[PDB]
Write a protein that binds this DNA or RNA. Structure first.
Ligand SMILES: [Zn+2]
Lengths: 150, 208, 261, 206, 124
RNA sequence: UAGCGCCGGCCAACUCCGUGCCAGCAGCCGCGGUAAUACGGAGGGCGCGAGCGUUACCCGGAUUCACUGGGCGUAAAGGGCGUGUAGGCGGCCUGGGGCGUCCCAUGUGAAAGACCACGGCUCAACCGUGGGGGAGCGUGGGAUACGCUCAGGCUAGACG
RNA sequence: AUGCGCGCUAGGUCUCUGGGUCUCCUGGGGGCCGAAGCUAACGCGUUAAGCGCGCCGCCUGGGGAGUACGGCCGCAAGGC
C-alpha cells in the first residue's frame, strides 16, 4: 500500500579477536504521496534484513504533512546537529528543487513544488533527520488561528 | 540539422511507442511489438535501477524526440516558457504544439512529423494565404493553414486527406477536409495532449 | 519469480493427473516446478547451456519432468507427443515466451496439426489484443484471422509491469487458445487463403480494392475480374477491409480463386 | 574442536545399527566383507535415485537388503525390470538368495544424507556455496525439523585458501544423548579438488 | 564580529593564485626544446615518462610532458606549450600540444584524434 | 556533405581481443605485475550535431571573509593583568525643535541595454513604435513612534 | 587553554564571611550533583560553554615559519 524509497546502504565494521565483523545500515523512506511520510534507519548483519527493519521502523514512525496545492504552507529553517535545512514554498510548475536526500523524502510526501537548501555538514543521515523535523514543524492558517483565537 | 537515421530504435530506447514513423508504427511492426528492449549488444540484460539524473534525462530525451527538434531550439523554447506567465509545463507544451510542422501533422496533411517538416520546407503549405517554408514557424490562434493550389493534386496530400474523411481532429483545431485547409483555434491543454511525458521531470532536469 | 501468480496461470489452464504438459522455454523452472506438482507428465525444450545446471537442480526432487536439448522449430513435435504422452488424455502447452519468438512459435504449433487441446501462454498485451480481436477494433489483422481460423482465442486478464522484480518496458497478458475441431471454414486453397488474408491488410487505412489489385502481378493485370468476383460473392472493395469476418474471407477465397483455380 | 560422530555417540539409544546380524569369531570377517561389498555396489549403482540408507540383516544363509530411496520408481524401473536385474547381480555376487527391499523416505527434505548429497551436487555444478547452504537449511527448517545445520569444508569457488561456511538454524544440541539427531556426509569432487559437506538435522527429543 | 568592528576593519577579499606562471595569461606559448629526458613517477606509480625541457617566448624555462606513444622531439624542436599538470611527476606543470610545430601526431590513432592531433585515416 | 567527445564513481553510455607496474591513462579518488567495463584496437552504446573537444581567465557551487549568512574550553582563534584617551553604545516621566527616519507632490535619473505589449524582415536572430519601472540625489509640504538634540523633573544603574 | 558589564532561566548539597525577629529567613565568596537549554562529542549548566544587548581582541587547510626582510625596544641574550 505504501511506496518505499532507498537512501543509503553503508557497510560498517568493528574489530574482533583477529578479524572484522561487518554490519549493514539502511535508510528508507516510506510514503503514500498524500501527506504521510515515515523515515527508518535499520541495522542488520545482512542487507535484506536491514532493508526490512528500516521499512518496519518507517511504517511505525509516521508524520502527517499539511499539503495544499502540493506545496508547503510556510518557509522553514531547521538545524539538526551540525546540519541545516531550508525549505521554501513554490508556485505551481516549479518542481522539486532539492538534493538527492530531501527530494527522496519530499517526493513521497506528494510535494510537487518547493525550493530547498542544505547548509553546514551534509552527512545524509543528519540531513534526513533535519528534513523530518522541518516537515514535523509545519502549521496551517487554521491551526495558528485555533491556537490564538480558539 | 535535425536527426537523420534509424527511428524505431528511439521507440525501443525510450520504452514507449512514440509514433514517429507514421503508418508502420500502427501496423504490427512498430518494433515495440517485437523486441521492445533497448538496442545494442546489452539491450536485453537486467539493468541497474536508474539514477535521478538518468530518469530526468530520459524524460527530456523522450519529449524532445517526439517533436524531433534540436537540443538548442529545445532549450531556447524552455527558456522562453520559463520567462513567461503561468505554469512552465503547460506553456512549454503550448509552445511545442504551436510549431508549423507539428500543426501540419496534427491537421492530417502528413502521417509523420518528418513528412510534415518536408512538406513545409518544400513549399506545399500556406499560412493565411502566404507561402511559409519554415518548419519552426510559430502559428497563433486564428490562423488559416492550407495546402498550396499547385500541390492540391499531389498523390501524398490527396491520399492523406482522403483518409481523414469521417475522422476527428484535435479539439484545439478545425479542418475542412474538402477545402484543403484547417484552422488553429487555441493553445492545447495538458489534458488535450496524449503525451506519455511527465513534464515535471523536464523542469527538474533543466533546473540543474 | 512471480509468486502465487504462477499457480494462477496453471489454474487458468486447469491441468490434473489426467493431463500431460508441454513446456516451451522453462528458464529457471518457476512455472515448471508449479506445473510438476499438478501434472502427470511434463516435457520441456531448453537450448541454453548456461541455465541448464540450475534448471536440472530445480527439477531434482521431481521425476515426471523430462528436458530435451533441442530447438522447438527443428524438432518434430508430433513424435515427442507420441512417446512422452502415451498415457494421458489432454495434451496442453503452458509457456512464457521471449519477445522475438512469440507469434512464429505459436504458428508452427498450429500449422503442424498436433493433438494439442489448449495452449495457455503469457505474451505481450498488444499481441494478446491482436490475436483476440473483434472486427474493426484496429486490432483486427492477419494474426487474428489466422489464429481464429485455427484456434479459438480468449484473453484472461492483463499482467501489469509492476510484477517482475526487473520492471519491463511493456505489460504482459495471459491468453488461451483452444484447438478447434477441424478447420474453421472449408477452403482447400489454404496457401492462397493466407495470401489473401495478408494482402487485404497491406494498408490498414486503404480500401479492399487497393489491397487486392496492387498485390500479385496477375492481380495487377486482371483488375476487372477481382471486382466482378467480389460483387459475385456479395462483397465490395469500398467498405474498409478491416470490417470483414472470417467466413466472408472464406467465401472470397472460394470465389476469387475459383475464377482462376 | 574435533567433534565425534553424532551417530556413533548414539548407537545404543535414539539410533540403530545399519547392519543387524550375528556371527561367531570363526565366520565374522567374511560376512562383514560381503556386507561391505554389497554396500559398495549399492552406492555405485543406485546413486541416481537418491540412496539414503542401506540395511542388511541375516536369518539363516539369507540376506534382506532394504534400500531407503527418495525416488523408488527409478530403483523399481519399468515393470520391475531394474530391481530384478539388480537382485540377479547381487545374488550372482553371493549365493545367498538375497531379498532386496525398497522403501520411500517420507519428506526427502528431512533426511540429512539426501541434503548433503544435494548440496554436493550443487557445488559440483559451480553454484554459490553460501546461498545454496542457506536455501538448504531453509528447506529443512520449513518442514518441521526443529534443528538444521550445514557445513561445507573448504576451497570455496575454486579459491586458493580453504575456509568453512557453516549455516545453521534452530536447536542442534550435539551434547545431549536423547536428541535423535540425523547426520549425513557427502564428498563433492570438482576440478580444483575435493570438498566435504556435513548435514545435521534435529527431530524433537526423547 | 560586532558591526563597529566590521566598519573599522572590514572583510579582506581572497585572491586566487595562478597555477601556470610561465604562460603569462595566454592559452598557449611557443618554446624551444633543450633537453629530452625520461623521468620516474611519485610513489604508487612506476613507469618512465617522457619529458622535455622548454625555453619559452617568456623568460621562463620549464619542464614539459609529452603525451602519446612515440615522439620525434629532438634537441632543437620548436614546440607549443599548454596548461595542465601531471599528478605524478614532481615539478612539471605543462603539456605539449601534439601536431603543431615539430611534434607530430602519434602514428595510428583511431579513437581520440582531437587530442593527439592526427588527421582522419582515409578509409578504403 | 557528417563529424566530434565520452562509455570505473562523480556523469548518461559494456563486451571481446593486445600488453602484464611495461606501453600508457589521469579533473579528483586512482587504473596498469596474465579474467583490465579505467591503457591500445574493434563491435556496440550515450551526448551534441556543422560542429565537437582542449588550454587560459571571470562568477557560481564556496555559508571557504558569513550585511542577508560563520566562529574563538579541547579542531586555527580571548590580548599575561590593570588604569585609561579618542571612538562606539546607553535608565524612567513630561514639553519644544524636526537632524536621522517615514509619507506626498515634483525636477533629474540622457540615447542605446533590461522588462511588458504591438508590429517589419516568408519565422528567428535583428530591428522599430509605445508603456512603464528604477537605487540615488535636488525643491516644496506634512507626521512625531523610535534614535539625536534642548528644557523641566524621578530613583530601580552609579557614587557618597 | 573560558575578555569585560548588565538582565532573565528548577533545585539540591558542602563550605568561608556578615545581618535578623535565630528549627529557620536573608546578602557576598569558594566547590559538587543536576531542570530547561546549548554542544560534533566530551561536557557546561544562577560562579554557563543557556537565552539576549553593548564594546574590544582575534581565526580562515597543513609544512615552509613564528623563518627571511623591514621597522621599534634592549648593555646583552633577546622581545614585539
Ligand atoms: Zn515505432
Amino acid at each position: 500500500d505504501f511506496e518505499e524509497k532507498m537512501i543509503l546502504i553503508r557497510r560498517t565494521a568493528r574489530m574482533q579477536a583477529g578479524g572484522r565483523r561487518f554490519r549493514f545500515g539502511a535508510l528508507v523512506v516510506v510514503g503514500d504521496r498524500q501527506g504521510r511520510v515515515g523515515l527508518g534507519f535499520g541495522k542488520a548483519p545482512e542487507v535484506p534484513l536491514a532493508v526490512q527493519k528500516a521499512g518496519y521502523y518507517a511504517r511505525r514512525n509516521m508524520v502527517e504533512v499539511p499539503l495544499q496545492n502540493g506545496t508547503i504552507p510556510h518557509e522553514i529553517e531547521v538545524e539538526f546537529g551540525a546540519s541545516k535545512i531550508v525549505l521554501k514554498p513554490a508556485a505551481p510548475g516549479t518542481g522539486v528543487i532539492a538534493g538527492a536526500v530531501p527530494r527522496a523524502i519530499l517526493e513521497l510526501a506528494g510535494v510537487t513544488d518547493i525550493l530547498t537548501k542544505e547548509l553546514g555538514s551534509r552527512n545524509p543521515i543528519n540531513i534526513a533527520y533535519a528534513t523530518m523535523e522541518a516537515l514535523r514543524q509545519l502549521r496551517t492558517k487554521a491551526d495558528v488561528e485555533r491556537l490564538r483565537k480558539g | 540539422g535535425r536527426y537523420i537515421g534509424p527511428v524505431c530504435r528511439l521507440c525501443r530506447r525510450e520504452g514507449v511507442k512514440l509514433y514517429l514513423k507514421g503508418e508502420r508504427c500502427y501496423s504490427p511492426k512498430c518494433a515495440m511489438e517485437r523486441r521492445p528492449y533497448p538496442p545494442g549488444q546489452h539491450g536485453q540484460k537486467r539493468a541497474r535501477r536508474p539514477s535521478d539524473y538518468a530518469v530526468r534525462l530520459r524524460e527530456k530525451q523522450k519529449l524532445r524526440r517526439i517533436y524531433g527538434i534540436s537540443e538548442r531550439q529545445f532549450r531556447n523554447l524552455f527558456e522562453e516558457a520559463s520567462k513567461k506567465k503561468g505554469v512552465t509545463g503547460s506553456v512549454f507544451l503550448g509552445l511545442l504544439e504551436s510549431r508549423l510542422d507539428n500543426v501540419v501533422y496534427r491537421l492530417g496533411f502528413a502521417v509523420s512529423r518528418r513528412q510534415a517538416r518536408q512538406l513545409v520546407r518544400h513549399g506545399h503549405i500556406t499560412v493565411n494565404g502566404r507561402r511559409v517554408d519554415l518548419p519552426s514557424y510559430r502559428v497563433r490562434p486564428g490562423d488559416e493553414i492550407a495546402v498550396a493550389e499547385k500541390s492540391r493534386n499531389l498523390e501524398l496530400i490527396r491520399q492523406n486527406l482522403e483518409a481523414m474523411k469521417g475522422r476527428k481532429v484535435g479539439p484545439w483545431l478545425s479542418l475542412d477536409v474538402e477545402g484543403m485547409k484547417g484552422k488553429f483555434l487555441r493553445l492545447p491543454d495538458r489534458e488535450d495532449l496524449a503525451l506519455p511525458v511527465n513534464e515535471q521531470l523536464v523542469i527538474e532536469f533543466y533546473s540543474r | 519469480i512471480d509468486t502465487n501468480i504462477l499457480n494462477r496461470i496453471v489454474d487458468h489452464a486447469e491441468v490434473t493427473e489426467k493431463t500431460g504438459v508441454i513446456e516451451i522455454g522453462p528458464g529457471i523452472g518457476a512455472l515448471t516446478e508449479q506445473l510438476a506438482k499438478r501434472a502427470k507428465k511434463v516435457v520441456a525444450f531448453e537450448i541454453d547451456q548456461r541455465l541448464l545446471p540450475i534448471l536440472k537442480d530445480t527439477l531434482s526432487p521431481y521425476e515426471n519432468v523430462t528436458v530435451i536439448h533441442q530447438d522447438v522449430l527443428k524438432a518434430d513435435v508430433k513424435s515427442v507427443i507420441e512417446e512422452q504422452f502415451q498415457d494421458c488424455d489432454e495434451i496442453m502447452v503452458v509457456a512464457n515466451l521471449p519477445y522475438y519468438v512469440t507469434t512464429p512459435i505459436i504458428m508452427k504449433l498450429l500449422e503442424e496439426h498436433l493433438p494439442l487441446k489448449g495452449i495457455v501462454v503469457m505474451l505481450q498485451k498488444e499481441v494478446a489484443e491482436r490475436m483476440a480481436a473483434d472486427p474493426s477494433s484496429k486490432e483486427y489483422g492477419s494474426l487474428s484471422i489466422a489464429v481464429q481460423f485455427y484456434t479459438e482465442a480468449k484473453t484472461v486478464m492483463i499482467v501489469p509491469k509492476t510484477v517482475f522484480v526487473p520492471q519491463p518496458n511493456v505489460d504482459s497478458a495471459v491468453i488461451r487458445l483452444i484447438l478447434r475441431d477441424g478447420p474453421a471454414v472449408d477452403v482447400e486453397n489454404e496457401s492462397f487463403f493466407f495470401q489473401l488474408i495478408k494482402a487485404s491488410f497491406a494498408q490498414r487505412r486503404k480500401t479492399l480494392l487497393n489491397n487486392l489489385v496492387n498485390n500479385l502481378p496477375e492481380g495487377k493485370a486482371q483488375k476487372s475480374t477481382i471486382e466482378q468476383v467480389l460483387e459475385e460473392t456479395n462483397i465490395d472493395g469500398k467498405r474498409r477491409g478491416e470490417s470483414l469476418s472470417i467466413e466472408e474471407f472464406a467465401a472470397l477465397s472460394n470465389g476469387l480463386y475459383k475464377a482462376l483455380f | 574442536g574435533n567433534k565425534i560422530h553424532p551417530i556413533g555417540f548414539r548407537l545404543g539409544i535414539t539410533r540403530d545399527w545399519e547392519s543387524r546380524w550375528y556371527a561367531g569369531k570363526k565366520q565374522y570377517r567374511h560376512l562383514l566383507l560381503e556386507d561391505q561389498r554389497i554396500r559398495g555396489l549399492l552406492e555405485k549403482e543406485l546413486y541416481s535415485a537418491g540412496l539414503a540408507r542401506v540395511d542388511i540383516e541375516r536369518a539363516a544363509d539369507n540376506v534382506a537388503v532394504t534400500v531407503h530411496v527418495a525416488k523408488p520408481g527409478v530403483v523399481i524401473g519399468r515393470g520391475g525390470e531394474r530391481i530384478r536385474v539388480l537382485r540377479e547381480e547381487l545374488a550372482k555376487l553371493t549365493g545367498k538368495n538375497v531379498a532386496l527391499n525398497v522403501q520411500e523416505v517420507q519428506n526427502p527434505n528431512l533426511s540429512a544424507p539426501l541434503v548433503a548429497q544435494r548440496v554436493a551436487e550443487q557445488i559440483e555444478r559451480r553454484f554459490a556455496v553460501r546461498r545454496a547452504i542457506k536455501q538448504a537449511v531453509q528447506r529443512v527448517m520449513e518442514s518441521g525439523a526443529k534443528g538444521a545445520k550445514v557445513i561445507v569444508s573448504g576451497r570455496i569457488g575454486g579459491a586458493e585458501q580453504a575456509r568453512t561456511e557453516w549455516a545453521a538454524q534452530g536447536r542442534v544440541p550435539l551434547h545431549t544423548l536423547r536428541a535423535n539427531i540425523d547426520y549425513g556426509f557427502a564428498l563433492a569432487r570438482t576440478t580444483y579438488g575435493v570438498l566435504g559437506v556435513k548435514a545435521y538435522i534435529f527431530l524433537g527429543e526423547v | 564580529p560586532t558591526i563597529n568592528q566590521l566598519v573599522r576593519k572590514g572583510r579582506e577579499k581572497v585572491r586566487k593564485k595562478s597555477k601556470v606562471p610561465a604562460l603569462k595569461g595566454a592559452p598557449f606559448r611557443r618554446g624551444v626544446c633543450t633537453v629530452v629526458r625520461t623521468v620516474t613517477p611519485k610513489k604508487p606509480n612506476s613507469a618512465l615518462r617522457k619529458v622535455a625541457k622548454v625555453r619559452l617566448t617568456s623568460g621562463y624555462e620549464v619542464t614539459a610532458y609529452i603525451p602519446g606513444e612515440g615522439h620525434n622531439l629532438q634537441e632543437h624542436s620548436v614546440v607549443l606549450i599548454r596548461g595542465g599538470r601531471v599528478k605524478d611527476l614532481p615539478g612539471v606543470r605543462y603539456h605539449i600540444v601534439r601536431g603543431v610545430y615539430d611534434a607530430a601526431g602519434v602514428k595510428d590513432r583511431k579513437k581520440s584524434r582531437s587530442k593527439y592531433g592526427t588527421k582522419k585515416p582515409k578509409e578504403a
